[PDB]
Write a protein that binds this DNA or RNA. Structure first.
Ligand code: MG
Lengths: 441, 213, 441, 213
DNA sequence: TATATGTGTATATATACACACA
DNA sequence: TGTGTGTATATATACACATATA
């Protein structure tokens, strides 16, 4: 039994500080490049591993959440389940990175079904945008199986909208239109005046107006008659139950309105009949203001663009254009890394293919017979040759049919094809490759 | 009011409004979007319904689900069914073994204290595919596992989807099964009390003779 | 809208009957051969799948339960988590088929920790007694990846204790000593008279007594004075909370006893000091009977041996010896099946190895010269030869290093070894293999 | 009276009795087996502890976990600690970031209502390994993640087990950490009120300034 | 002052079924 | 006439954290 005095200052300055910085840098603030919180990175890495074999197979969300603990996840699997269910829907994300199968929620019920019901898979958006996974940075933690961050070609953090709370810091980024973000990325890459991306909410038919930095999310109403009114859209933050209980119910028990549901396939819709107690002004402007304020049809939102940059530290951006410029500047370096690595890999592959072709051409018509000898002495004799050096375990590991006519020519043609690929990779630049990647979208 | 009840616009008034009794919260998320707003209402039933055969009315009402069912409709446990909020009660549970052979007959037993809804055809069951086979370019729906196993042999190469619950269906299939319904109108035979006592009763030897034939 | 009438009689006779029979044959009653409920079989199959490449790696219970739905599990993963936790306790199983890491419970607290903490792997007992997995029966459902049942060499349904409730039927089998079960299996296999296996509970230091088909589980007490006694063991049905709240505390709040916790390495140790108003009779027999009855130190159990046989039906046994004899009779057939399949497979392997070994000698300065001809030339000329009629694809697919003397003699040695092994497999019988595999436990 | 509270045989008598404040119920397992029966008692908390800084006594007592720390012990919020059921209070929590970074300092802030407890050394923290490294034939125990990272480079080839909570520990390791405990006795500094206000006060700018250095 | 958003820490609760044992 | 066992059905809660908006 050991008894050591420990002042509260040491506890607060070590353990509490570690927890606070962990909540900031590893729980709730998304990465600037890929837009993933670490739990979402784990979920998508596990989904990629699951979809390695068949890319169109739907895997149960319980199956995806179970295996994240082996990738380096250190928390409960229900958190991973809930994070995954929030990534595989088309009502909360403009650019979903998982397809879902089952009930993943809607704009009326913003609650996915239990994970025992619903399946998920990596989306075609992920394969279309997230490139150069093999060149992603390696996490400093040996037990962190997924990379430090993925390498998309456009900032995904701006696409689906992020809301996270940490100890001492919080982030709130509104969703943006994919086309505007892609256009802004192209403008930044070409070295132009970057146009600010437009804010777009999925499944939203209302209006979004930028006033004094604030964003006004406005629903829509129309008047069928003097006392009847149809609400065709409500601000994005509302549910059916939330809007009914907060606005529509504390207006009928007050004797003001009588409302009926019309939430058809279009989305949110209500039919409100006004009683004589509720009176509207003569002019249209004040009446419009009173109606649009009483029914909660205006939502005001501010942007707190706080992200974890490529160096792992916190960063606050005044607007979105600066974030896009920083993302493009970081991503061009990884495009250059891809180019260099592919140059080296194509050179190595061409060297191996040419060595194998020369070995075959010497075996069929040459002094090398591979008969009446041993394996170790054959390996030494091959190691004598400089061209065959460093390829002795791959030259004798070739099948018999490689000595046939139909397969001796294929090796030389493959060597020529790899040489032409290496030549192609030795002439491109970062800008052209990035432009092609953007053109893929 | 009932917390999780989703009212129809014509509920309580004179119409043919139908109450949908799902077996969970997850099975009703898509219902409010694909239903007829004027004529359809829903209420999620938590878990396995109370075995209420031979129970007293006071004991019956101590269950949250049965009390909420009686509250949403106009059903009084000791009185006739005369003025109800919903014209039809459409039980629509998951199509697996538990939902189809445990919750559904127990719900029928609970509704048997008004053996006039059955006579008037106001107790319905909404058929739901338990198996969805992607045969070539078309989706085939099998409502029971027995039907799929019987018909599994005479199909070409395909892949099946097992529908554990109504939360496993997509909005297209949920909408198809809601706005194009297949209804089983339950009718009580003359000896319904014997069949309910055998399956729901104290004597477990009555389930052994029945299960051995 | 397809309003079709449906009588209640048809509903009961189809869907209620299907559910009841499913509960009996697929949820609650264990299989006679492998001693698994279907959920336990799915858990074992998933753990075996996870064990490929590393038999000693520990996998989270969430990881094991996540992937069982892909194997054909049609229920929520929570039941699989609970079953997996129950299967790796050791304090509850005489023969644990899953090795556990973390808090899986104890006799005092018969509840495992949450699945977010505990790990499991396949125990060495499973690898010891479960043999011939490749010859296990194939389930009639293509989506049921695990077999119809596994093939242990001793009845595992008799080892760990089984309790299950279905609709109309229930099963309760007490745990039995592994050594006694193995001895009874050997006696039944050898045709001698079979002795009844002894009932043994895990980590129980009390006494088990058989009387008219009923088992008495007795705890022990020792008097350290004329008024103070020490309860050293209590029946197996109790945990600390239940014994305290049902026996010790009702007596304490009556002026009878005052009790202290004397537990330790062996659980359920109490120190009871009697009060003045609790009259301990001078008769030793009466004192013993009163202490047994008042302190709940005697548990009375009876078995209800209900199982699922190899045909999938339900069988009720009145004895354990009958079950052992039936299990041995069934398992002898699968031993014979293993012998036959091994004969066939090893004959085919020897034929293939001989064909390859002779082809290689016929390439080294032989009539078959690979060089100078096309792919179809070899793949048709060799197909003409009777000896390479069905092996030409694997003949030409062999590597170049299979053409030196060192690797050419190894092919002939492999062929000779396969011939000798096939000859060995052609002489053994069921009894010899069964005795060999039983004696290796 | 207090449910889930396992009592020591000398609770309420003059002895060096210790109360183990355990985070969660999965962590209280194996304690009843490896504890000193005459001197060790335990109580499982439930997750994060309510932030009690600047709160009223009537508001702290509305928390069940905080209410059943003043009932198990003789602690009264408005009174000094002079008649205590347990001599020492040993907070033992999961050594991950969440436990020892939020639950432990929150519990310290709650117990700061009686600084005489800290002055007497009756508030202790039981150090528990967060990483167990199988190095060769031996095991290395690391109580904090930073401790593991500081020696990970110099460590030889090994495999580490991350201990999410006390429910991830073997009975041997639990027994080793309980019967051979490494306590840290908490001592309140001269300005503990300012530190507690910074960590748990309503102004987040102080937290930002603290985190930015 | 009062909500609410999402990633985390911990739990909990009704029901059905059989049957022997109190 | 309770009741405990173990696969299944479904669901629920209390806590922390920040910052804008009502
Ligand atoms: Mg814990």
């Amino acid at each position: 039994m050991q008894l050591n005095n420990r002042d509260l200052k040491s506890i607060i300055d070590n353990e509490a500080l570690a927890y606070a910085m962990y909540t900031v840098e590893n729980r709730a603030i998304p990465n600037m490049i890929d837009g993933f919180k670490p739990v979402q990175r784990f979920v998508i890495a596990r989904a990629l591993d699951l979809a390695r074999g068949n890319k169109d197979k739907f895997h149960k969300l319980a199956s995806i959440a179970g295996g994240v603990a082996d990738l380096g996840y250190h928390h409960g699997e229900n958190s991973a389940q809930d994070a995954g269910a929030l990534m595989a829907n088309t009502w909360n994300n403009n650019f979903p990175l998982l397809d879902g199968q089952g009930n993943f929620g809607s704009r009326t019920v913003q609650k996915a079904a239990a994970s025992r019901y619903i399946f998920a898979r990596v989306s075609k958006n992920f394969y279309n945008v997230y490139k150069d996974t093999e060149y992603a940075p390696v996490h400093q933690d040996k037990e962190h199986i997924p990379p430090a961050f993925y390498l998309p070609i456009i900032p995904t953090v701006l696409l689906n909208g992020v809301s996270g709370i940490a100890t001492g810091y919080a982030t709130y980024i509104l969703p943006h239109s994919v086309s505007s973000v892609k256009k802004a990325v192209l403008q930044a890459l070409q070295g132009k005046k970057v146009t600010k991306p437009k804010v777009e909410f999925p499944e939203f038919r209302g209006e979004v107006v930028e006033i004094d930095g604030q964003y006004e999310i406005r629903g829509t109403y129309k008047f069928t008659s003097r006392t009847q009114m149809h609400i065709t859209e409500i601000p994005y933050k509302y549910d059916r139950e939330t809007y009914v209980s907060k606005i529509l119910d504390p207006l009928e028990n007050k004797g003001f309105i009588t409302w009926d549901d019309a939430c058809g396939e279009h989305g949110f819709g209500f039919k409100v009949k006004f009683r004589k107690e509720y009176s509207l002004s003569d002019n249209e402007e004040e009446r419009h203001a009173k109606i649009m304020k009483d029914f909660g049809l205006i939502e005001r939102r501010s942007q707190n663009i706080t992200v974890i940059n490529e160096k792992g530290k916190l960063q606050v951006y005044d607007n979105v254009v600066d974030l896009i410029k920083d993302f493009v500047e970081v991503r061009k370096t990884y495009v250059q890394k891809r180019i260099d690595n592919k140059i080296k890999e194509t050179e190595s592959a061409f060297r191996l293919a040419f060595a194998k072709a020369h070995f075959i051409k010497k075996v069929i018509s040459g002094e090398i017979v591979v008969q009446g000898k041993t394996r170790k002495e054959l390996t030494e004799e091959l190691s004598k040759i400089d061209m065959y050096s460093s390829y002795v375990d791959k030259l004798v590991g070739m099948n018999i049919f490689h000595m046939t006519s139909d397969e001796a020519k294929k090796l030389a043609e493959e060597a020529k094809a790899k040489k032409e690929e290496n030549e192609y990779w030795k002439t491109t630049d970062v800008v052209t490759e990035y432009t092609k990647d953007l053109e893929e979208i | 009011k009932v917390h999780k009840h989703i009212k129809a616009n014509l509920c309580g008034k004179d119409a043919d409004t139908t109450l949908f009794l799902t077996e969970g919260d997850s099975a009703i998320g898509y219902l409010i979007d694909v239903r007829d707003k004027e004529l359809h209402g829903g209420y999620p039933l938590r878990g396995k319904v109370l075995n209420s055969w031979g129970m007293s009315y006071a004991d019956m009402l101590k269950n949250k689900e049965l009390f909420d069912i009686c509250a949403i409709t106009g059903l009084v446990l000791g009185e006739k069914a005369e003025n109800l909020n919903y014209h039809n009660i459409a039980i629509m549970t998951d199509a697996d073994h538990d939902g189809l052979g445990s919750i559904y007959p127990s719900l029928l037993g609970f509704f048997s204290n008004w053996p006039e809804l059955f006579e008037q055809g106001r107790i319905r069951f909404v058929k739901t595919p338990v198996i969805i086979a992607h045969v070539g370019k078309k989706q085939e729906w099998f409502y029971t596992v027995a039907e799929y196993e019987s018909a599994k042999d005479a199909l070409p190469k395909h892949s099946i989807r097992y529908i554990k619950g109504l939360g496993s269906l997509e909005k297209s299939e949920y909408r198809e099964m809601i706005q194009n319904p297949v209804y089983d109108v339950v009718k009580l035979p003359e000896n319904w009390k014997e069949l309910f006592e055998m399956l729901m009763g104290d004597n477990a030897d009555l389930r052994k003779e029945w299960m051995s034939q």
